[PDB]
Amino acid sequence: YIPDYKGMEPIGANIEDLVDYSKDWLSRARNFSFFEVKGTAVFECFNSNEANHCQRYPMSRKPRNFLLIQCSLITSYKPATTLSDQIDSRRACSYILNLIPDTPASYLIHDMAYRYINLTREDMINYYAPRIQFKQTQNVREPGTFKLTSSMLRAESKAMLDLLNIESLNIASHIVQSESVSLITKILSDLELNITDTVLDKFFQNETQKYLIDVLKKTTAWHIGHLIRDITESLIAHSGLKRSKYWSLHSYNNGNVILFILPSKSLEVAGSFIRFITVFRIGPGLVDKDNLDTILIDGDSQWGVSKVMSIDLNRLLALNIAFEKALIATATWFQYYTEDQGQFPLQYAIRSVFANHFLLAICQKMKLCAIFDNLRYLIPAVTSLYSGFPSLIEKLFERPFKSSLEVYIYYNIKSLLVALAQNNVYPSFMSRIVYKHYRSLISEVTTCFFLFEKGLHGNMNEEAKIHLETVEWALKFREKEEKYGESLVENGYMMWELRANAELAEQQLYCQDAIELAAIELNKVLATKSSVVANSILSKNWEEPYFSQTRNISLKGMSGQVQEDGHLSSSVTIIEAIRYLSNSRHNPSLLKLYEETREQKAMARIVRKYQRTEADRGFFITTLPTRCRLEIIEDYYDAIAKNISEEYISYGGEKKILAIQGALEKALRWASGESFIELSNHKFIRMKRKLMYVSADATKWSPGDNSAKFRRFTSMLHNGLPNNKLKNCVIDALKQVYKTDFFMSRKLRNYIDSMESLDPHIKQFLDFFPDGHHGEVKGNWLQGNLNKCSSLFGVAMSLLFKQVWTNLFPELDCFFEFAHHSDDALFIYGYLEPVDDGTDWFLFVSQQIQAGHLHWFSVNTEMWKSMFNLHEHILLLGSIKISPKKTTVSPTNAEFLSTFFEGCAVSIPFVKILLGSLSDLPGLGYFDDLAAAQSRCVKALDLGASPQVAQLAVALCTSKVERLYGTAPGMVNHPAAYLQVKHTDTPIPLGGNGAMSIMELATAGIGMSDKNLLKRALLGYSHKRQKSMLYILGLFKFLMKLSDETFQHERLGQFSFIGKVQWKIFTPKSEFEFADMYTSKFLELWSSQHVTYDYIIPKGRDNLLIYLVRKLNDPSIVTAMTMQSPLQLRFRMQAKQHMKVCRLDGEWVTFREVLAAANSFAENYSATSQDMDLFQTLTSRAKVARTFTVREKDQIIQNSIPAVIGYKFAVTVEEMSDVLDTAKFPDSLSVDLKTMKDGVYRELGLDISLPDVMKRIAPMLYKSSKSRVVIVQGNVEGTAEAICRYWLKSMSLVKTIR
RNA sequence: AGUAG
Ligand SMILES: Nc1ncnc2c1ncn2[C@@H]1O[C@H](COP(=O)(O)OP(=O)(O)OP(=O)(O)O)[C@@H](O)[C@H]1O
Ligand SMILES: [Mg+2]
């Protein structure tokens, strides 16, 4: 039952009115938005901005620090060990005591060394012994730390401890710029020195390792990369709750470098810094002699006493993987070079590239990520005909240039951009090479940009910046309401009152006739497609109950209810669903839940979206009623958008590319021709057709919009339904999200209560909140909410411009072909220019102007400009503003094809994943992290990476995971030590090599090595019957015994098929709301009485409350609802793999004891019929986008596997109704049950009639049902076999495999 | 002092 609503009516808008307005418009001097790209122009822009910078800021003479850890390597580095520190540290401390301090930091170094040397033998034994054998002592009160009292420190060190607890350089100057360039070049020269059998293996040991690894395997950047890994592992160890109050001293290399870790604040909070000093022998490497605290003179060498640093947990886990990030970036650069030149980079280029990448990965500053974010938009701006490069250049100077790595990364940027704005071959950025494609040049800067961590900003400044945008745009909206009534901003301005003013065409104001005409223009392609559109709209399930869909019972954020203090409480969607179900006696449809909450005002707050850009973005969290309204609107608009061929975002990811290519091909085929313009009687003029590809981007797409356009937009859209009830419901849904209560988050309010005085900057921001916690926001639709509706509206405006122009100049047969995706868009304006000198064309235009058609004044020279001006104006009539900064005009599609929007099928630079697989891991146990990393590397391979670059990343990630979890030789959890079997023969869940050629991880799945090991052991036992291949079966039986505890298939990650060792890193001791409303016993009897609901969501209020409480009382969702900071998890994992009992065998004992338990059980194992049966059951040039279907499900079924398996467990009326609703095709569930029973008799001797069989295949078929988009070189076919063969053909980088 | 501004 769709509720009645009043709805809108047509206003009789005529196209002729807009055409006449345009005629009057395109008859006068109109200023082009963009500027011409010329070398002199860019050079003058840079020089003038440099001149202004001096006045803008107060100049400084002392470059600030850019190196976090300063090291110095003279000899190859042998990784450190507990047996190495006891010797090194002693030698290094004797050296230090030999020195003579002068500065307070040097004095503190001296005091720490003197204390450490004078520790007693028992103190040292406890100081280096493992935590298991650790014994607390008077001096060494923790394993790897010692206690220094305030009495031993001298006066200088005491003063230094007490001290512990905007200016820019002359970039315009030439002396400063050369000085910085020389310093950074010296550092890069130092990091470039040389310190004194599957087919893929052949192609890797011959091509990649011969030119990349064997080249960097001897440079100072490959050994300092390990020195700064050990130095950061030491800090991570000394950044716990109990350790982080004591002093520590470590030595590395052979005593050359010493790390002095200070009394800090534990990094298990959100605002602590671990502080340290480094004393090293001055030499080649990351040395900045200007920023060293002192250089103490030694007879033969000189020791560089660094200054007391302070590195947070985001800059401490970013140096721990500096080497991996730098090496993966260098591998990507190597791959891109060996596609753009066809030859391997010379030995000299790759070493410099690696040195630059390492120096970038070490310097994790935010003043550099901003520059490398501006550069990505600057490079397309200076390599295109017309662009907004002056604005981007002026943005480049908005920041201080303080350290010597911003005056060098800038100087380089200046040179590169001034050189690119002249050849308009693309000069390289890092090396001295020259490219032959734009893709390589843009990928260089993209990769250099991803080497910076997400969220280096600083918390509260970014939170405030997030709030200010939304507050200021809303205040501007109110100002626009003060001028001209609120009935003009809300309902728009008629055309007749635009021509009288012509200044109403601003953002946040929309015409009425323009919107109606845009809807009518879409109705010319939605009217030949009426039945399909109606069927698509009805296909969306409105009657389907709310809260019975995965999206409404998810774990994403959602605002709660206005509390007593005035702030809007946070929560996740599942608690809100539970609350509504508890307070209501029904589970209502999407429409019937709207009319219940139609009265409630939409409320929203904003949470920082931790990203890697200047001026971080902010995600919007909205209450339940607002979510319901937005769901109604999006469900209506998506069903129509997916039926329009120019609105991308509604495509599957592999059709976005296959459609942009089709559009570009149609444009090119149009260009291959010549048009004839008629003259007085018979003479024709031949005009050459040409294309001008205009990319696009809108400034403040949602933040500066007015969400009342869609009210009149949908009232005219043709959906094909026989009645307007759903249309009117969508109109009302749009009407209720007009006004919102924006709540300032808790952090901003809390700190603003502490400011001594409020500047006018934020006083205008605190006047927007009359209550102090909330404010009214109109028009803005909470960025990220209406994305398909906005894109469809933009497409409508573009087609309106098409029609207006085609009516303006009937004689000229021009060609437009647009493609929109959110705000991003591509316009392919096709124009005509004279073939001869053109005097006849000019005469014809003059004759037309004289005849009476005065709008030809703007169609004589540069026809493509008067098309863009009119298109931009007609878009602005719909409150859409094409950006004057990030838009680009170019005769060639190189600038766009390199980028292709900013969606998800726009690769995602395959580097973004490879560098991502090194961090942000689930932390759910060795297996469940080694699976996630390999899966991310496989995705990177599927996103264009080469097998050799995607199989080096796998090795790097596997080694990092092994170090993190201790599964490394001679470390806490090495399987080979405790278990008799070798490292490669152990199942992955219990600790195994788990490293395979990326072909295995791609073609097959992750964890299939477990199945290989199981098959090997079973075959060996069956045929040879040797004792050797029975220990493995004992290990697998132990795995099943451990796994039997879990039920419901409560798996968050990969499926082992043989069970997993159970870990639990963290527990939110604070029980969640509504997590205890049924007795825990009740939720165990319910889980057995209603078996069906393990698969299909219940669709009844009473039977859904229990299901939601159960999903809330699950020890894998509760973990996922408190893993707010992945950095905290990654840091904790290193200290949890040790004695901490973080894995339960039913008794919460360490993983170290599990190896002994398995060795005991494996030895005392005997083959049994049940074991054999269970084991047998266990073993039952032009880019393009394809679908890699791995296994896929049997066609004869046609019913979702969970639905049918639930049908088998269906005995209650509620369960049967839920099954029938959930099943896509009812009346056929019995067919699939019969098919399953028949099939089980083939590959399995067990019968499904008894339970515990269907639980096995379901994860396998879930993995099979996964279908992923694969980026191929263009010659590949749709089938999986062709994709795999193409991957095979891509093993070599410069040689064919055909 | 450092991170940040
Ligand atoms: N994380 C996101 N999730 C969903 N939609 C998003 C997200 N980020 C941006 N959008 C969509 O893109 C719009 C913003 O576009 P974009 O990020 O290109 O820049 P902008 O805010 O329009 O302005 P400018 O081009 O000046 O940066 C948002 O209003 C929303 O429509
Ligand atoms: Mg944009």
Ligand SMILES: [Mg+2]
């Ligand atoms: Mg954009």
